[PDB]
């Protein structure tokens, strides 16, 4: 009644479910829809659906979904931090954790129920596009250790690339993340 | 104006406190660092001004040789020989906080062309006062350091008082 | 609360109480110092905060992370021995030395 | 490449680079100095203690976020430099930013 | 239930109460037994108490009372910001009064229960050692104001003489008195 999970029914209604989908109000303010948060949500089946993942759709699935879970949930506690101070005295490492943060959550955590293919997105899509982020994350990683600048590494075009990355067929998609897949492995050891 | 929506908003509240109250206790932590390094550079400071007064007096005593043997053609090529150099760098090394602008400074000395039979008690004089301007150098560029990180220094305790007495 | 009550000479060991102390201590300076870290940057610490970075990684890591072990009494004071070993002396500035003697 | 001191110190500057403007014509040097810094090709000014170079409300006035020459105090005159350590010090803490 | 002043029980037993002792935590934490919180206590019986005090235990006993309680204002109003550079940077009259606030709060206010010869200190016992610890701040701030060192001062015998006051029995007190004042007016002379 007034958007406040302590109604009776908001409450009797947990304890007794699985999953739990939490909505909030300013990500659909910002119209960034679905508005899913991603922190006050949670579920209870992910731990008995790992052979039916590592049967039919990879074989470290499974890691890669714990990988993008950390890097989330860490990212977060740096939010704090970057409220407090402003997000320009912070480290190269620590800009670099929140803009992989930012590049998952619109690239991959974003989905248009009206668009022609952009709607209906299945298991090797997905993973597909978690594995191009997991990459570009590990190369820019190495990349700020050797001392190129995260300026740079933004500019670096695969950024727009995996981003738009989305918005594919489902079709010609097995041939499009092994070019980018490439692409970034050589234009990230190319500087 | 309004007071937000009273409930539900309380958690949050209390969830704000508690940010606040960490941001506090995260910025002590942060000036103590501060100054552990500007009682260092203080220290140095120390050292730089006595290496300038010692090649000021010894600039001056070999300054006042001139005096009693005033040279003419040594003043003259004083006035003849002398290039007016700029070395006008900027060079930043580190950037403490936000960006900073740190100045340093580097000295490019010339060559001093003089002709075979030179020397004179003017050119102990000219090298006592390079050697002046390296300790010049040396103080201009310690006591710009010092003075940003002091600003430091002032400018998060000015935000852990802000915070701690009006938020 | 009732923890001074079940632990020492004859209940378990002697060394019980004073290594829960420090570790205790270690975590909380490590969980500070990683935050300070982040906003400041691993060019401006000292020797004794880098040590208290690790040991705070390796504590969450290899103490708590234990998945379906069994761990006994005996096993659990040995991994908190050695996960105290990787701060040096004159730091545990909470345990006896007749005991940092015959562990550590 | 700059300074503010009495002649005969001053045309010793010249001596080696460095141009010297001589005291003789602003003792308050705050002329020389604005004068200086409006030709402003300069790395420093170091500026003799006539009778104080600290006041740079002025100065940093004109100034107001420059990357300009870096006023520096140098010296009066070479008689007695024992106490003048301490003496920087105590100035340089108390009266600038840190307390006390 | 949580520690707070300001529930209605403890809003109404201030305001029917008298003395109030806080005990704390903290001051617990840091060994200092028993662990009263003398920034926070406050008591309301000293007024209508002074008279018995004038006619059973001495004649000046209010005045080194508030004496001590100034000392102890003074010295936690310091304590301020003396952490922030180290307790070395201060000048000589400021390292006086936190070392005389240590003597105080450490040999003065803290009682072993446990002890044999230690738990219980009779008002002139209490008199005498408040008299000891003013008698040594006068002839340091003597010393001070001529400008001996602040090193001496903290090296004299006389320090541990009285550390070991509270120790004593309640039979050989007043020689010990009589003697540890002589002494101490005595060697604050030489050096």
Not at chain 1, 44 to 71: G, K
Not at chain 2, 119 to 137: D, G, H, K, V
Not at chain 3, 74 to 100: N, Y
Not at chain 4, 84 to 93: C, K, Q, S, T
Request: aromatic share 8%; charged share 30%; net charge negative.
């Amino acid at each position: 009644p007034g958007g406040d999970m302590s109604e009776p029914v908001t409450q009797s209604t947990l304890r007794i479910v699985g999953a739990f989908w939490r909505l909030d109000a300013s990500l659909a303010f910002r119209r960034h829809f679905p508005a899913i948060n991603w922190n006050g949500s949670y579920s209870l089946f992910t731990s008995a659906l790992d052979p039916w993942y590592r049967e039919n759709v990879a074989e470290d699935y499974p890691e890669l979904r714990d990988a993008i879970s950390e890097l989330l949930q860490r990212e977060a506690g740096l939010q704090e931090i970057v409220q407090l101070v402003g997000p320009d005295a912070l480290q190269d490492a620590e800009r670099l954790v929140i803009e992989v943060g930012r590049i998952i959550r619109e690239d991959f955590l974003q989905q248009n129920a009206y668009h022609e293919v952009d709607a209906y997105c299945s298991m090797k899509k997905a993973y597909g596009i978690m594995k191009m982020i997991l990459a570009f994350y590990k190369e820019a990683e190495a990349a700020i250790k050797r001392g190129v600048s995260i300026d740079e590494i933004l500019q670096l075009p695969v950024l727009e690339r995996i981003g738009r990355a989305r918005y594919v067929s489902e079709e010609e998609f097995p041939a499009y993340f092994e070019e980018a897949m490439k692409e970034i492995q050589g234009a990230f050891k190319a500087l | 104006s309004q007071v937000s929506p009273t409930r539900m908003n309380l958690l949050q509240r209390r969830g704000q406190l508690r940010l606040a109250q960490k941001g506090v206790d995260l910025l002590k932590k942060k000036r103590d660092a501060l100054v552990a390094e500007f009682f260092g550079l203080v220290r140095e400071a120390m050292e730089a001004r006595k290496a300038l007064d010692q090649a000021a007096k010894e600039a001056y005593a070999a300054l006042l040789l001139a005096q009693a043997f005033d040279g003419p053609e040594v003043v003259a090529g004083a006035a003849l020989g002398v290039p007016p150099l700029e070395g006008v760098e900027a060079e930043v090394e580190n950037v403490w906080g936000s960006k900073v602008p740190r100045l340093k400074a580097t000295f490019p000395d010339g060559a001093l062309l003089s002709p075979v039979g030179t020397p004179a008690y003017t050119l102990e004089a000219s090298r006592a006062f390079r050697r002046y301007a390296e300790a010049l150098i040396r103080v201009a560029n310690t006591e710009t350091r010092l003075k940003k990180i002091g600003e430091e220094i002032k400018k998060t305790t000015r935000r852990v008082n802000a915070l701690e007495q009006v938020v | 609360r009732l923890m001074n009550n079940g632990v020492g000479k004859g209940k378990t060991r002697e060394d019980h109480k004073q290594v829960s102390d420090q570790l205790y201590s270690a975590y909380a300076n490590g969980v500070d110092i990683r935050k300070l870290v982040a906003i400041i940057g691993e060019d401006a610490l000292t020797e004794n905060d880098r040590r208290y970075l690790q040991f705070a990684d390796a504590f969450e890591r290899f103490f708590i992370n234990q998945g379906q072990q069994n761990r006994s009494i005996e096993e659990s004071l040995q991994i908190a021995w050695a996960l105290l070993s990787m701060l040096p002396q004159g730091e545990l500035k909470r345990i006896s030395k007749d005991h940092i003697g015959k562990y550590y | 490449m700059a300074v503010i001191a009495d002649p005969e110190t001053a045309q010793g500057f010249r001596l080696a680079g460095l141009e010297g403007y001589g005291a003789s014509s602003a003792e308050e040097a705050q002329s020389l100095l604005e004068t200086l810094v409006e030709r402003g090709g300069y790395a420093l000014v170091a500026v003799d203690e006539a009778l104080l170079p600290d006041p740079e409300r002025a100065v940093e006035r004109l100034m107001r976020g420059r990357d300009l020459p870096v006023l520096l105090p140098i010296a009066g005159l070479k008689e007695a430099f024992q106490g003048h350590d301490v003496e920087g010090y105590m100035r340089e803490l108390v009266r600038k930013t840190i307390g006390f």
